[PDB]
Structure formats: structure tokens, C-alpha cells
Amino acid sequence: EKLKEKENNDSSDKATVIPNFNTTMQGSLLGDDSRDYYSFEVKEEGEVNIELDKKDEFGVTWTLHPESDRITYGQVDGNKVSNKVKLRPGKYYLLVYKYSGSGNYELRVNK
């Protein structure tokens, strides 16, 4: 089961809401669509696993920052761009963006 992104989401004030943990978002970065912003909320301090799965071969990663220099980057490894981050309760912004090519991805925040 997945939830589709909602364009235009190219900046944080237009971020697509990830309504809960354990919700796979589906998106794409085709052509000049190079940025897809999402937001999520943390209600209790804890480890957050953020996982992007590439559905095509292309250069895509992500950058996490709180709504607030605390930023955190996705670690690329083959078809997965991942990280495990200790977050305090708060709203967070997750910029999915590409540096080469074009393609599709899924994004999940696991808690």
C-alpha cells in the first residue's frame, strides 16, 4: 500500500504530508521535476528510520531538516538511500532531490 506525492511540492511550504510512520509515499522526479518536499511529525523522542527505494536507475538522495545546523543526509547504497536518526518530537521536512538522471522512488519513515 502506498500514498502518492502531490505536486507542486518543490518547496517546504508546499510539502506533501506524510500522514504517519509506516506509510510508503510514491513519487517521481522526471525531467525538470528535481525536488519533492515532504513533511512528517514526531510525537515522541526515538530512532527514526528513513528509507528511499529507487524504482529506476538515477541519482537521487534526500536531506532532512527540522522546521526550526541540524541537517541529515540520506546515505546512498545501490538502490536504497537510507539513514537512522534520533529525533526529538517536532515537525520535520524531508527534501527528496536528484543530482542526475530521471526516475521514480518510494519513501518511508519507519518507526
Nearest-CA neighbor of 36 among 95, 76, 81, 104? 95
Site residues (CB under 8 A) for its own copies, limited to 2-31: 10-12
Place of cell 528535481: 34
Choose, by CB under 8 A, the member of 2, 7, 71, 84 that binds its own copies.
71
Residue placing its CB nearer to its own copies in the complex, 22 or 73:
73
Nearest-CA neighbor of 38 among 103, 110, 109, 104? 109
Burial string for 22-51 (b: 16+ CB within 10 Å, else e) reads ebebebbbeeebeebbbbbebeeeeebebb
70 annotated among ligand-binding-site residues: no
Instruction: Name the segment binding its own copies (CB under 8 A); options: 15-23, 44-52, 64-72, 83-91.
Output: 64-72
Give the sign of the dihedral formed by CA 39, CA 11, CA 62, CA 65: negative
Choose, by CB under 8 A, the member of 97, 103, 106, 108 that binds its own copies.
97
From the CB of residue 109, how many other CB atoms can be counted at a distance below 10 Å? 22
32 annotated among ligand-binding-site residues: no
12 annotated among ligand-binding-site residues: no
Instruction: Name the segment binding its own copies (CB under 8 A); options: 17-25, 43-51, 68-76, 83-91.
Output: 68-76
Contact residues: its own copies, CB under 8 A: 10-12, 32, 34-35, 59, 61, 63, 65, 69, 71, 73, 76-78, 93, 95, 97, 99-100
